Symmetry: C11
C-alpha cells in the first residue's frame, strides 16, 4: 500500500477534483519582459511545489526526470547561447501520471558553466511545472488562458506580502513528528 | 486497485460513453490563419486538459511522451526553421489507451533557443490533443469534421468569455482536502 | 479485470460479431482524385474513430504506434517530397489485436516542416484505419471491395447533412459522470 | 481468460477443424496477369479478413507485424522499383500461431512515395494472407494446389455478384451492442 | 490450459505416435529436374500444411520464423542470383518443438523484386517443411530415404485426382461454428 | 505438465536407459569416400530422427538451432567453397539436454546459392545428430568407436530392404487420431 | 515492510505535512557573493542533511545519483574551467520521490584534479538539495522566495553560534544502541 | 520435479560418490604421439559419454556450449592452421555443474572447410570431457595423474576387445519403451 | 528476513536516531595541509568504518561501488597527475540508502601504477565516507560545519592516545562464535 | 531443494568447518623451477578436484567460467608468447561462493594452436584452484604460507605413491548406482 | 534458507559483533619496503581468508569479482610496467555486503605474461582484503590506524613459529564429513 498503489478514497478524490478547478489569484502570478517587449505571465517554481504539496500531500505526488538533453552550446562572440530540454514525469500515489517537456535557456553570459547550470536547472523546473498543469487550473492550467489573464489585469495592483518569521522552524528536532514516528513502529 | 487496474463500473462507463458523444460548443473552438490565407480551427491545450479532467477525473487519465524527435534545425538567413514531432500515449485508469503524433513548428525566429523551445513544447501539446481525440467528440474528435465546422460558422460571433476571480485560490492550504486525506491513512 | 484482461460475455460477443458484418452506407464514404485522374474512396479518420467507440465502447479498444519511420525527405525544386510510414497496433479490452502499416505523403509544399507534419500525421491515421479494418466491414473492411463500391455508385448522391448544435457541450462539468464516479469509489 | 489464454471447447474445436477443410468456391478466387503472360490466382485481402472473422470470431484471431523491411528502392529511368517484405504472425485466442513472409512490389511509378506506399502495404496484406493459409483450405491453403485450380477452371463464368446495401449501417449507434455491453458490467 | 501448455492424453498420444510412422503414398510426392539432369522428390507445402492440420488439429501445432537472412543478391548479366535462408520453429500444443533451416533460391530472373520475393517465400516454406519432418515419416521424414524413393518408383503412375468442388464454400458464415462458439462464452 | 516439465516414471526411465545401450545393426550404418580415399561411416539423418521418435516419442524430444554461422564463402576458380557451422540443442520432455556443433560443407559447385543451401542444411542435420549421440549408443554414440566399426565389417553384406508401401498414407484425414483427440477435450 | 514499502500512519503523515510548511529561521541561511557583486542565499548541505534526518528519520529518506555528467573541462590560460551536472533522486520510506539536477562549478584553479573534484562533489550535493526542496519549505523550498528573503533581511545580524562539544561522542561503542539491537533478532 | 530440480536421494548420492572414486582400467585409455615424439594419453569422447550415461542416467546429466570461438585461421603455404576453443557447461539433474574450456586444432590440411570442421568439433568434445573430469576419477580425473599413468604402463599390452554385434539394434521400435511410456500418461 | 528486508524495531530506531545526532570528539578528527597552506579537517576511513559497524552492527550496513571512473592520467614532466572518482552507495539492513561521489588524487609520483593505485583507492574510501555522512553527525555530517570546527579548535590539543594490544586476537579460532553459530542450525 | 538452495545441516557444517582447517601433507604438494632458478610449490588440479569432491560431495560444489580473456599472442622470433586469464566462480550447494582469476602462460612454442591451447586450459584450472583456496587450508589455502612451506621442507623424501589399479574401472555399467536410481524414481 | 537469505540469530550476531572489535596481534602483521625506503604493514591474503572462514564459517561469507580492468601495459626499456584494478564484492550469508577496489602492480620484469599474471592476481587479493576490512578490526580494519601500528612496534620480535604438520591431511576421504553428508539427505 505504498506510493503508486494507493487508490483515492471517494472523499479525498472528490475534494481534490473540486479544488483543482480553482483558478489562482494574483498572489501566484508573476511576470517578465519577453524579447518582443511583451509581458509574459508565469508561476514561480516554489509556488507550484507548495501548491502540489498542499493539494496532494508531501507524500501524494512525485516527479522524475525521464531525460535531459543539451540541445546546443554556442559561443558567438565572447558569450554563450545554450538551449536545454528536460522531460519530467509527475505521478500521484494513485499511479496516475503526466509527462511534459520543459526548456531552459541561457543567452549572453560569458561563463560556460554558469550558462549550462542555468539552462539545465530551468529546463527541469519548467518541465515540472508543465507536467503539473495537467492536473488542473489550481496547479497552473489557467496560466495560458487569455481570458483568465485578461481578467487578472483588471484586478487591483497588489503589494508584495510580508512573511512572518515569527513561527519559522528554528531547530532540526521535530517533537510531534518524532512522537508520531515512534508510535508508528507499533 | 491503482491506476491502470481499475475497471469502470457500469454506471460510470455508461455516463462517459454518452458524454463523449457530445460535440463541443463555440466556446471551445478557436482559429488562426494558415499560410494559404485560410482559417484553421483548433482547441487550445488548456481546454482539452480541463475537458479530460472533468470527463475522467484528475486521476482518471494519464499521458506520457513515448518519444520526441527533432526533425531539423535549419538556419536559412538569420532565421531558424525547426520541425519537431512527439509521440504521446494517453491512458485511462482502466488501462485503455491511445497514442498519436503531434508536431511542433517554429519558422522565422532569430533565436535558436526560442525556436527549439516553441517547437518541442507544441509538439507535445499537439500530440496530447490528437491522442485524446480518439476517445470521442467531447474530447476533440468533432474538430476536423467539415460538416461540424460548417454548422459552427452558422452561429453568431463568439466574444471573449469573462473569467471571474472573485473566488480565486489565494492560499495554498486546502482544508477540505487535508481532512479527506487525513481521514484516509487510518 | 482491467483493459486487456476482459473476456467478452456471450451476449456482447454475439452482438458485435453481427454488427461488424454490416457494410457502411454512403454517409461514411468520401472520395478524392488520384493522380491517374481516378476516384479513390475512403473513410475519414474521425468517422472511423466514432465507429470504433460505438462498436466497442470508449474503453473497449486502444491503439499504439509501434513505430514510425520517415522514408525520405527530398527537395527537388523549391518543393519537398516526403514519405512516412507508421505501424499501428490496435487492441480490444479482450487482448485481441491487429496491426498494420499506414503511409503518409506530402508532395509539393515549400515548407519542410509542413510537409513532415502532414506526412507523419496521415501515416498514423492511415495505419489506425487499416488496422481497424481487420475487425470487419462495419469498421471499413468493405471499402476496397469493388462490388461494394460499384453498388454504392448506383445510389442517390448525398448532400452535406447539417449538424444539430443545440445539444452541444458548453462547459467542462459532466454532472452525471461526476455522480457515477463517486458511486464507483464505493 | 483473455486473448491467448482461451482453450477451445471440444464443440468449437470440432466445428472449426471441419469447417477449415472446405475448399473455397469461385466467388472467392480472382486473378491477374503475370509478366509471363500467365494467369495468377489469389484471394483478395478483404475476403480473407472476413473468412477469418467468421471462422474464429472478431475476437478469435489476431495478427502483428514482427518486422517489415524495405529491400530496395531503385530509380532506373524516371521510374521507381521497390521491393518490400513483411513478417506477419497471426494468432488464435488459443495461443496457437503461424508466421510467414509477405512481399510487396511497385515497379514503374514515377512517385517514390506512391511506390513505397504500395509496396509496404501489400507486403503486410500478403504476409497476413500467407500466415492465415496455414490454418487450412478454408483460409486459402487450397489456392496454390494445381488440381484445385484446374477443377475451378472447369466451371461457368462466376458472374459479378451484387452488393445489397438496403440494410447498410447509416449511423454509429449500435443499440443491441450498447445493451449487451452495459449489462456485461454486472 | 492454452497452446504450449497442453499435455497429450494417453489416447491422443498413442494414436499420433502410430499415425506418424506411416510412409506417404505416391499421391503426396512430386518431383522436379535438378541441374544435374536428375530427379528430385519433394512434398508441396500445401500438402504438408494439411498433413499437419489433420495430424495435430488446426490448433495443435504452430510455427514461427526465428530469423530470415538474405545471403546475397548478385546481378551477373542482366539477371539476378539470390540466396535466402530462414529458420523455422514449429511447436505442438504440447510445448514440444523442432527447428530447422529452409533455403530459397532464385537464379536468372531480370526482376530484383520478383527474385527476392521468390527466395524469401520459399526459404520459409522450405524451413517449415524441414522442421515438420522431425515429427516422423507421416510428415515427410521418409522423403529422403533412398529405399523408400526406390520402392515408390516401382509403382504405377497415378492420374491427378479431380477436386470435388460441389460442396465448395461460397459463404463466410459457418452457422455450425458460430454456435459452437456461442456456447463457449458460457 | 507440458514439455520440459515431465519427470520420467521409473518404468519409462528404466526401459530407455537399457534401450539406449544397444549398438545399432548394419541396417543403420552407411558410408562414403573421404578425400584420403578412406571409408567414413555415418548414420543418415532420417534414420536418427526415427530412432529418436521411437526412443522418446514424437513428443518426447525436441531440438532448436541456438546459432548458425557461415564461416566463409570462397570463389577460387569458377567454383565455390563454403563452410558452415550450426549449434543444435536437443532436449527431452524431461528438461534434460545436450548441445553440439554440426558442420556443413560444399566445395566445387558453381552455384553460390546451391553451395550455401547445401552447407547450411548439412550443418544443422550434422549438429542434430551429434547432439543426439550424447544420449547413448542407440542414438549413434557407437558410430565412432573403432572396435564397433571393426566388428561391423566382419559381417556379410545385406541387400537394400524394400519399403512395403502397401498401407501407405494416401489421405490427410486420420479418424483414428481425430476420434481420440475428440475425447481428449473432456 | 522494508524501505520503499512503508505507508505513513495518519499520525506521522499529519505531523510531517505540518512540519514541512515551516519556513526556516536565519540560523539556516547563509550567503555568498555572486559574480554580479550580488548576494546569493543558500543552505549548507550538512544542514539540509540534518533537516531531512530529523524530519523523516535516518531511515525515512534515501537518495541515489541517477547520473553525473561532466559537461566540460576547459584550460584557458594555466587555469581550468569545469562544469558538472548530477541527477539526484530522493525517496521516502513511502516510495514517494523527487528528482532534480544539481550543478557543480570550478573556475580558475590550476589543478585539473582539484577542479574536477570540486565540481563533481558540489553537483551531487546541489542536486540532493534541490531534490529535497520539493518536499516543502522546511526542507528548502522557501529559499528562493523573494518575499521570504526580503523579510529575512529585516532581522539583526546574528553573531556566530558556538557549538557545545561537552557531550561529544568520544568512543565508537553505543551501549543503548547495542541493547536495542540485540533485543531485535528475537 | 524436472531436470535441474531433482535432489539426490541418500542412496543414489552415496552410490555415485563411491563409484566416482574409481580410476579407470586400460580398456578406457588410448594414446597418440605428441609433436615432441612423446606419448599422450586420453579417453575417447564416446567412452566418456557412456561413462556419463551409466553413472548418472541418460536423463541425469546435460551439457551446453556456452560459447565457441575461432581463435584463428591461418594459410601459411597451401595449408591451413586453425585453433578453436569451446566453453562447455555440464549439469546434473541436481542443478550442480562444472564448466571448462576445450580446444580444437587442425594443422596442415589444404581444405579450409575440413580444417574448421575438425577444430570446431574437437573443441566441443574436448571441452565436454574436461568439464566432466570435475566429477571424479571415474569420469576422467585420473587421466592426467602421472602416478596413475605410470602404474598403467606396468600392465600387459591389450588386444582391443571384440564388438559383439549379436543383439545389435535392427529396429526403430522399442515395445517395452513404448510400453512404459504409454502407461506414464496415466 | 535477510539484509535489505529488515524493518527497524521502535527501540533500535529510536536509539539510533538519537545516537546519530552526536557530534564527534577531537579523537576522531585529523588534519592535513591544503595547497593554499590551509588546514583541512577530515575523518580517517578506518574510524568511519568502525563508527558504522558500531552504530548499525557489522551486518547492519553495506556499500557497493556503483561506478569508478578515471578522469585523466597526465604525464607533465617525469611525473603523473591522476584524478579518479567513485560513486559509492551505502545501504542499511532496512533497505534505506544514500549514494555520493568520492574523488581520489595523485599528483607528482613518477610511478604510473602507484599513482593510479592511490587515486582509485582514495576515491572509493572518500565516496564511502561522504555517503555515510548522510546518516548524521555521528557518521561525519558535522565535519564540514564551520561552527563545529571552530569550537573544536578551542579545545586542548589532544595527545595521540595508546592502543592496548594485550588482549589482541592472536589466532583464527573463535570459540563463543563457533558455539553460537553451531546452534543457529537448530 | 536443488543445487544452490540447500542449507547445511549443523552436523555437516561442523564436520566441514573442522576438516577445512587441516593443512595438507607432502603427498599433495609438488614443485617446479621458476625462471629465477627458484622452487615454486603448487597442487595439481586433479588433486584439488578430488579434495573438493571428497570435502563437499560430487554434488556439493560447482564452478563456472564467468569469463576468459586472451591478453596477447606475440610472435617474437619463430616462437609464440601467450598470456591468458580466466575468472572462475565456484559455488557450494549452499549458494555460498568464491571467485578468482587464474592465469595461463605459454612461452617459446612454435605452434600458435598449441600455445593458445596450453594458456587457455591452464588459466581455467589455475583459476579454479585459486577460487577453491578461499574455503580453507584443506583446499589449498596453506600453499602460499611461508611457514607451512618451510616446515614442509623439514620432512623427508616424498617417493611417488603407487596407484594399485586392481579394482579399477573395467566396464561402464554401475549396478549399485543403477539400483539406487531405480529406487529414487520412487 | 540458502546463502544470502539467512538471518543471524541473536547469539551468533552478538558473538561476531564482539569478535570483530579485536585488533590483531603481531602474528598477523607482516611488512615490506616501500619505494620511499619506508616500512609498509599489511596482512597476507591467506591469513585474511582464514580469519574470514573462522569468523563467519566456510559457508558464511562469499566474494565475487564485479570487474577487473587492466589500466596499462607499458614497455619502457626491455621491462614491463603493469597496473591492474579489481572490484571485489564480499557478502555474508546474511545478504549484507561490502565492495572495494584492489590494485595489482608489476614493474620491471621482462616477461609480459609474468607481469600481467602478477598484477591481475594481486589486484583481486588486494580487493578482497580491502572489502573484508569493512567488517571490523578483526578482519583488518586496524591495519592502517597509525596509533595501532605505533603500539605494535613497541613489542618484542617474534620468531615465525614452526608449523606442526602432525595431523596434516594425507588422504582425500573425510569420514565424518561423509557420514554427516549421508545423514543429511534424510
Amino acid at each position: 500500500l505504498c506510493f503508486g498503489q494507493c487508490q483515492y478514497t471517494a472523499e479525498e478524490y472528490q475534494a481534490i477534483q473540486k479544488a483543482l478547478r480553482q483558478r489562482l489569484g494574483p498572489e501566484y502570478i508573476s511576470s517578465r519582459m519577453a524579447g518582443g517587449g511583451q509581458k509574459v505571465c508565469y508561476i514561480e517554481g516554489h509556488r507550484v511545489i507548495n501548491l502540489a504539496n498542499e493539494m496532494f500531500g508531501y507524500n501524494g505526488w512525485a516527479h522524475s526526470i525521464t531525460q535531459q538533453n543539451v540541445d546546443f552550446v554556442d559561443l558567438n562572440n565572447g558569450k554563450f547561447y545554450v538551449g536545454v530540454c528536460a522531460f519530467v514525469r509527475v505521478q500521484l500515489k494513485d499511479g496516475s501520471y503526466h509527462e511534459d517537456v520543459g526548456y531552459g535557456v541561457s543567452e549572453g553570459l560569458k561563463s560556460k558553466a554558469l550558462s549550462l547550470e542555468k539552462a539545465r536547472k530551468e529546463a527541469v523546473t519548467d518541465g515540472l511545472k508543465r507536467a503539473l498543469r495537467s492536473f488542473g487550473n489550481a496547479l497552473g492550467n489557467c496560466i495560458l488562458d487569455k481570458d483568465y489573464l485578461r481578467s487578472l489585469n483588471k484586478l487591483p495592483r497588489q503589494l508584495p506580502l510580508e512573511v512572518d518569521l515569527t513561527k519559522a522552524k528554528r531547530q532540526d528536532l521535530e517533537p510531534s513528528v518524532e512522537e508520531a514516528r515512534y508510535n508508528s513502529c507499533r
